[PDB]
Structure formats: structure tokens, C-alpha cells
């Protein structure tokens, strides 16, 4: 009904036939979707005569009032939903000069005036959907140049006629939409009796190789840049498939979901520049060397699931001839997600020069191990990011990434890696910032396991079953600029004090789901282990679900910038006093599902001063006057956000006060 007074009014599902005039005079936005109305009362609209946005949905009206548009030239966008009028007077369009967006959905419209757009040619986008047409007759004369997006989806047109496009002979369009409308024939001169069509969309429409070849001629000497076509049933391609395209300068091309099978040699040589190129979900079986010849200027090439699924019964073996990418002299972004390449040939990526981001996630059906020269084809490309997720990589031989000199983000996570990290495996690397090894089988760490790569900033070891991590020289010692370290879910048992030394740059530490309860128990031999020492910059520390039941008071001495500390899911019952004193700047606390009972400033002294959010959502509170009563005062007087403070924070110890919100001291 009424939105907050940001010049906007919103009405949905109110289903009222008389608008509420209580809306402020100055507001200028109104939607009336999911409502029904007969006639527009201009008097209520006259109060807020300024109305840039007028939206109506799910209503049937014979015709809009021109007097309303005479009242409101300032209208900018008009949306129609489920109104079946076939012809509208052009005076409404003329009066609403500022109208720049017109929407036709669920209308079954059939006729428009020849000159509705004498001065409201301004509208950038025109859409015709859920309507049945066979010709594009809009205006008998050239106009409507400012129109840039024409939508003809959900239409029954079957052929394109040049005479119908006379209005757009002078008009230039960023993109023309003909998707979801099967066209079996294109009359010649249709794309020449039309202005600069920067784009053209033919999706979910039956074209096939034969017709598209004719369409290739039809686009000669045309200012086309955005040609996209999907589900065209393009089984294969030949040299004449894109022959006549040489007489234009395309920029992007889309062939997604066209289940294409075979690309002939040099099938794309008539595209001297093509910045973007889409080839995904296509049943390709084999790439010839010269299949991709002539792609001088390409920035982005996508091959996500662009190959035939492996079938051992059929011995499908979707195979890549080497040097097939050697002509992509400008390629920067190559994607090969969810593919079934049998393995890496020695010269797959030979010739790549500007290659920046290469993703091989789930690209190889059989990549057991990485050898000395498994990436030798990449020796001449500044590959900043390489992605090897989901490839069941059993083992990494040493010097396997020697060829990657400029690499900075390597994602070996989510594989099948069982290996002793001898350190020599990373020798060639110079500038890596992040290494993802999460979700693997097991790593056996050594003292010199990361010495070859002191450039690291992010080491993600999540659920990887670190062996020998309690070695006396910390395996993380050579790392110096590490900022994010993650050892979560590893169920680590014991940790040496030396593990985190010199890591002054360590900002984020994560140790959730680890069995470190022993190391802080008082009766632990050798005393409690203080692995959190010297951590000057630690911002976010997570220790969820560790079995903790006793915190030594001096573990957080060096945590001078600790912003968020999480200790939920543990078994804390009495955290001792003066434990958060050095935590001068703390913003968020989390102690949910612990066994804490008493809340008191002797232990939460500096902690509760200036927080942003606190969380204790399930605990066995003893709601007696001795302990909780102070906290109840702090609850009702403090502006720190306490989510679910009522329904969840409950007490039980007092049997009489069992199940009672802590709010009720």
C-alpha cells in the first residue's frame, strides 16, 4: 500500500479498484501489480501529478485515459500485465514524451498506429511477448531511432520480411530479440533494410546448419556485434557455415546448448576479431588442429561441458589435437568446467601468450598424477589463476608446477591427494598468494614443506588430515606474509607451541572442528599449550566445536586487535576472570551451545563494553538473582545486537524459573 516516503509507492495483492490518494503529493513511483481496477481516477493521480513510474499488473482495462497522460507527461515507464487490448491510440504515446519504457506481457496485441512515436521515439526498449504476430509492421515510415532493444519473444512469427523492417532502416538497435519464435525463412535484404543492429538474438529457434548458412549471407555488411544463438540444432559446422560473416566485425558469439558435434577445419577464420566466444553444453567429440584457426582477437573462451561424455562401452574418448589452441594469441580466460578430457597432452596450450585465468575444474576423467612436464605446454603464459578442483589428483610429483612462473592463485582443493609434502613440489613458484588444498585425503608435513614458497598469503587446509603437524620446527615457519590460515575439520589432536611463530601478518585463523580439548586442560602434562602468542594482527579467530572446557587466562595476551572471536559448540562452563583484558577492540562474540551458566563482569569485563553482536543462544543458565540478574540489567540497557535474545536465551537451573526467558530475571 504505502511505502516509506522515499518518493516511492508500492501496491501488491491489495486488489483494489480505487487508488489510495493518501499517498504524498511529492512521490513519483507507483506499482499496482496483482490488483484489479476499472478506470483511472485522474483526480487522485492529480494530487501526486509527478509520477515517473506507473506499473499495473494482473488487471484488464479497455484503454488508458489520455487525460491521465495529459496530466502526466512526466511518466517514464509503463508496464502492462494481462490486458488484452489490441489497438491503442497514438495520442497517449505522444503526450507521454518522457515515457521511455513500454512493457507488453500477456496482451495478445495485434495492431499499432503507423506514427505513435513522432516525439516519443525516446523509448530504449520495446517488448512484445505472450502475443501472436507474423509480421513486424510497427511504423510505415522511418522513426524510432532512439529505440535500442526490440523484443519479439513468445511470438508465432515464421518468416522475416524486409518491408516490415522499414521503420528500423534509419533506426539503430543495440539488440534485436527473435528468440523463442521459429523462423523458417529470411527474405533477402531484411538485414540491409535496417539500421545498425549491434545485436541479434536467435535462441530456442529451429535454424540448423542449412538455414544458418543462408543467415550467414544475410548478415554481410551489417553492423552486428552481439550475435547469440542457442538450441539452433547446429549439429556440425563447415567452412561455409560462417562464410559471409567476413563482411562484418562481430565481437561476441554464442553457440551454447546447440549440442554441436564436429567443427570443421578453419570454421571460424572469417571472424578476425571476436572478443567473446561461448561453446558450452555441446556434444563435441574431437577437435582438429586447424579447427580453431583464425581467432586472433579473443579475450574469453568458454568450454564448460563442451565435450561428449565419456562412454567406455562406446570408447568415445573426446580427444584434443595438440596445438589446437595455438592460434588464440590473445586469449586470457579459458574455462573447461565439467569436462571429460582423457588427459593432458604435452602441447595442449602451446602458443598461448596472454592467458590469465585457466580453470580445469572437473575437466579430466583421468588425471591421476602431475608429473615433471605435465604443464610444460604452459611455460609461456602468465597464468595467474589455475583451477584444478575435482580431478581426483592422486599425487603431485616434485617440480610439477615449475613451468608456472607468474602463478598466484592455485586451487588443488577438493581432489584425492595423499602425499608427503616434501616442499620440492612447489619449487618453480614465485608469486603465489593463495593455495587451496581443502577437502583432500591426507598430507604428511615436514619442516621444509613450504620453504620454497614464502610468498604465500592464504593457506587453506580444510578437512585434509594433516599428518605430523606437531613437528618441533613449525611447517608454517617459512611463511611470513600469511594472512589467512585454515585448519578446520581436521580433527587435530595435539599442537606444538612453535606452530604459530613469526606469523605477525596472520589476520584470520580458523580451527573449528578440531580435538584440542587436551591442550588447554589444566592437568595437561607440560602445562597448557599457548599456540596463540605473538599474533598481533589476528582479526577473526574461530574455535568452534573443539571440546573446550577450560581457557587459561593468558592465552589471549597478544590478541590486541581481535575483532571477532567464536567459541561456540564447546563445553565451557566457567571461563576464568581477566581473560579478555587485552582484547581492547572486540566487535563480535559467539558462545552458543556451550555449558555456560553465570554471566558476570568479573569475567566479561572489557568484553561487553562496545560490541556489535553477541550470541549465547542455547546455554544452561541458572537464572538466580546471584548471577543472571546482573546480565538482565545489561540486556535491557545495552545497544549491542543480541539475535533471538528472547525465544532462545532461556534458563533452567532454577526449577521454578526453568524454561523462562532470561529477560524475566
Amino acid at each position, epitope marked *: 500500500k504505502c511505502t516509506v516516503s522515499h518518493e516511492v509507492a508500492d501496491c501488491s495483492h491489495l486488489k483494489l479498484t480505487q487508488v489510495p490518494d493518501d499517498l504524498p503529493t511529492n512521490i513519483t513511483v507507483l506499482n499496482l501489480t496483482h490488483n484489479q481496477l476499472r478506470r483511472l481516477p485522474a483526480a487522485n493521480f492529480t494530487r501526486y501529478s509527478q509520477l515517473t513510474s506507473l506499473d499495473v499488473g494482473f488487471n484488464t482495462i479497455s484503454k488508458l485515459e489520455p487525460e491521465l497522460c495529459q496530466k502526466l507527461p512526466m511518466l517514464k515507464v509503463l508496464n502492462l500485465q494481462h490486458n488484452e487490448l489490441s489497438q491503442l491510440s497514438d495520442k497517449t504515446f505522444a503526450f507521454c514524451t518522457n515515457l521511455t519504457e513500454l512493457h507488453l506481457m500477456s496482451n495478445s496485441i495485434q495492431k499499432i498506429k503507423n506514427n505513435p512515436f513522432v516525439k516519443q521515439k525516446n523509448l530504449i526498449t520495446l517488448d512484445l511477448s505472450h502475443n501472436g504476430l507474423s509480421s513486424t509492421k510497427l511504423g510505415t515510415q522511418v522513426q524510432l531511432e532512439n529505440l535500442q532493444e526490440l523484443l519479439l519473444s513468445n511470438n508465432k512469427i515464421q518468416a522475416l520480411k524486409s518491408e516490415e523492417l522499414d521503420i528500423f532502416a534509419n533506426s539503430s538497435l543495440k539488440k534485436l530479440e527473435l528468440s523463442s519464435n521459429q523462423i523458417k525463412e529470411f527474405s533477402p535484404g531484411c538485414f540491409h533494410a535496417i539500421g545498425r543492429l549491434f545485436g541479434l538474438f536467435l535462441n530456442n529457434v529451429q535454424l540448423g546448419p542449412s538455414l544458418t548458412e543462408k543467415l550467414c549471407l544475410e548478415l554481410a555488411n551489417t553492423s552486428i556485434r552481439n550475435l547469440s544463438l542457442s538450441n539452433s540444432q547446429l549439429s556440425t559446422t563447415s567452412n561455409t557455415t560462417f562464410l559471409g560473416l567476413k563482411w562484418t566485425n562481430l565481437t561476441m558469439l554464442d553457440l551454447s546448448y546447440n549440442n554441436l558435434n564436429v567443427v570443421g577445419n578453419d570454421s571460424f577464420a572469417w571472424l578476425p576479431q571476436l572478443e567473446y566466444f561461448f561453446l558450452e553444453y555441446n556434444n563435441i567429440q574431437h577437435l582438429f588442429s586447424h579447427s580453431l584457426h583464425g581467432l586472433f582477437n579473443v579475450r574469453y573462451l568458454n568450454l564448460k561441458r563442451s565435450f561428449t561424455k565419456q562412454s567406455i562401452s562406446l570408447a568415445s574418448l573426446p580427444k584434443i589435437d595438440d596445438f589446437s589452441f595455438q592460434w588464440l594469441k590473445c586469449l586470457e580466460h579459458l574455462n573447461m568446467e565439467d569436462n571429460d578430457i582423457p588427459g593432458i597432452k604435452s602441447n595442449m596450450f602451446t602458443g598461448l601468450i596472454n592467458l590469465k585465468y585457466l580453470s580445469l575444474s572437473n575437466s579430466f576423467t583421468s588425471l591421476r598424477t602431475l608429473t615433471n612436464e605435465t604443464f610444460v605446454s604452459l611455460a609461456h603464459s602468465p597464468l595467474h589463476i589455475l583451477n584444478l578442483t575435482k580431478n581426483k589428483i592422486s599425487k603431485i610429483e616434485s617440480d610439477a608446477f615449475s613451468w608456472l612462473g607468474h602463478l598466484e592463485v592455485l586451487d588443488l582443493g577438493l581432489n584425492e591427494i595423499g602425499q608427503e609434502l616434501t616442499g620440492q613440489e612447489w619449487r618453480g613458484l614465485e608469486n603465489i598468494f593463495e593455495i587451496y588444498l581443502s577437502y583432500n585425503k591426507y598430507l*604428511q608435513l615436514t619442516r621444509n614443506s613450504f620453504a620454497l614458497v614464502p610468498s604465500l598469503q592464504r593457506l587453506m587446509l580444510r*578437512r585434509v588430515a594433516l*599428518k605430523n603437524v606437531d613437528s618441533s620446527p613449525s611447517p608454517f615457519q617459512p611463511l611470513r606474509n600469511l594472512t589467512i590460515l585454515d585448519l578446520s575439520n581436521n*580433527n587435530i589432536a595435539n599442537i606444538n607451541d612453535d606452530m604459530l611463530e613469526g606469523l605477525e601478518k596472520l589476520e584470520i585463523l580458523d580451527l573449528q572442528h578440531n*580435538n584440542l580439548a587436551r591442550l588447554w586442560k589444566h592437568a595437561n602434562p607440560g602445562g597448557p599449550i599457548y599456540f596463540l602468542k605473538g599474533l598481533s594482527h589476528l582479526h577473526i579467530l574461530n574455535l568452534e566445536s573443539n571440546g573446550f572446557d577450560e581457557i587459561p587466562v593468558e592465552v589471549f595476551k597478544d590478541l590486541f586487535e581481535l575483532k571477532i572471536i567464536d567459541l561456540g559448540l564447546n563445553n565451557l562452563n566457567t571461563l576464568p576472570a581477566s581473560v579478555f583484558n587485552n582484547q581492547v577492540s572486540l566487535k563480535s562474540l559467539n558462545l552458543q551451545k556451550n555449558l555456560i551458566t553465570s554471566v558476570e563482569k568479573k569475567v566479561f569485563g572489557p568484553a561487553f563494553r562496545n560490541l556489535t553482536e553477541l550470541d549465547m543462544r542455547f546455554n544452561p543458565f541458572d537464572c538466580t538473582c546471584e548471577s543472571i540478574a546482573w546480565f538482565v540489567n545489561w540486556i535491557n540497557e545495552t545497544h549491542t545486537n543480541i539475535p533471538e535474545l528472547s525465544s532462545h536465551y532461556l534458563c533452567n537451573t532454577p526449577p521454578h524459573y526453568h524454561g523462562f526467558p532470561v529477560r524475566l530475571f
Partner: antibody
Amino acid sequence: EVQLVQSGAEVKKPGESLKISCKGSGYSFTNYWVGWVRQMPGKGLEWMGFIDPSDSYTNYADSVKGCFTISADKSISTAYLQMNSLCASDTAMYYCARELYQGYMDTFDSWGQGTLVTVSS
Amino acid sequence: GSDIQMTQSPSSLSASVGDRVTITCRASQSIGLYLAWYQQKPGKAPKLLIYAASSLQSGVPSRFSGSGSGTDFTLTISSLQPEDFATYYCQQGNTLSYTFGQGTKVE
């Protein structure tokens, strides 16, 4: 094909140790992990810990280390779960399983026939 | 408490032969697509991995349909058989401290 065989049942007084042997036949056993699962009668499965027979690296779970200990040796090709001090509430059906790492998670492929240790005062 | 809590919410029992049985395994935290389904005979070893990941059959069985991701998961049998009248289980492979379901369908 892979065969995991455990020793037969035991009955023991509380307060004494007990050694349970799990022998694997039909595979390498020097690379596949072996885990131990305890099931109290009429109760759900409970996970105890796993050992890597490649170097006898053990990873107990949830303070099991206090009362139990897991050991294995190469040549006999057998993994041992040893109770340090048996007592009541440990009467359970003890399984050993090979841990396969299929998909991208650890899966207990083949299980032993199980040992029914019942402690009686 | 180092475990991810796992609950078989409906915990029904002993449906008739040929039915379509749906079992839901509910995880306290997002275990991702790392849930395995185990079937145990009433007096034998579980000894039957059914789902390598979530929704992926092991070598032996058939007619089992599982699905789900994140918090919740679902196992469905096409039609009960006399041999497939036994208890089930689900674990999470998201942490090295695995957690089998507290107790599942006795079907």
C-alpha cells in the same frame, strides 16, 4: 573380494585390558586406512577412530584416546584395537572397516564381521 | 561435542513391501554433498556402503535413489524387497571426526 576378519567374541571382568584384532585380506592394506566403529546393542553406530597402517598414524575421535588405543603392523596385515581398562557400558559390537575415500569423502567400503565384547561383573 | 549432530527426523518403521520409502537425514551444519548412506542387516555387519557421495550408487546395489545438499538429505528406495527390510544409517564426511546417524529407520 576384500576380506576383513576379526577375532571372536570375548567376556571379561571390568578393569582389565583386552586386545581386538582385525586382519585384512585381499588388498594392499599398507595404504588404505582402517577405522573402528562401536555399536552398543540397540543403539546407533558410534565412530571411534582410524589408523593409517602406512606409518601407524592414529587419529582418535572425541576423547576415545583416554580409554582405548589403536595399533597396526605391516607384515601380519592386521589392525589392533586395545581397550586400556574395560568396564561396563563398553559392551558393544565392535566393527573394523576399510576406509576407501570414494567420491570425495571417506567411505567405509568393507566391514569386518564384528566382535561382540560383553563385559560382565 | 566435536561432532556434527545428525538426526533421522521421521524414524518410521516396517512399511509394506513394494512401497516407496523416503528417509530424511538432517544435519546440524552444512555437510555439503558429503553424506553416505549405510544399510545394516538386523544381525550382521553394516558392511554395505550404498552412496559414495550423496546420490551416487556404490558398485553393488540398484533401485536406490538419494538426493539432497547442505542441511538436509533424502534416501528413497524404488520399491521394497524382502532383503531390503533392515535398518539404515547416514554419516557425514565433512570432518575427520565422522558422525553416523543417531539411529535410523528400521525398515
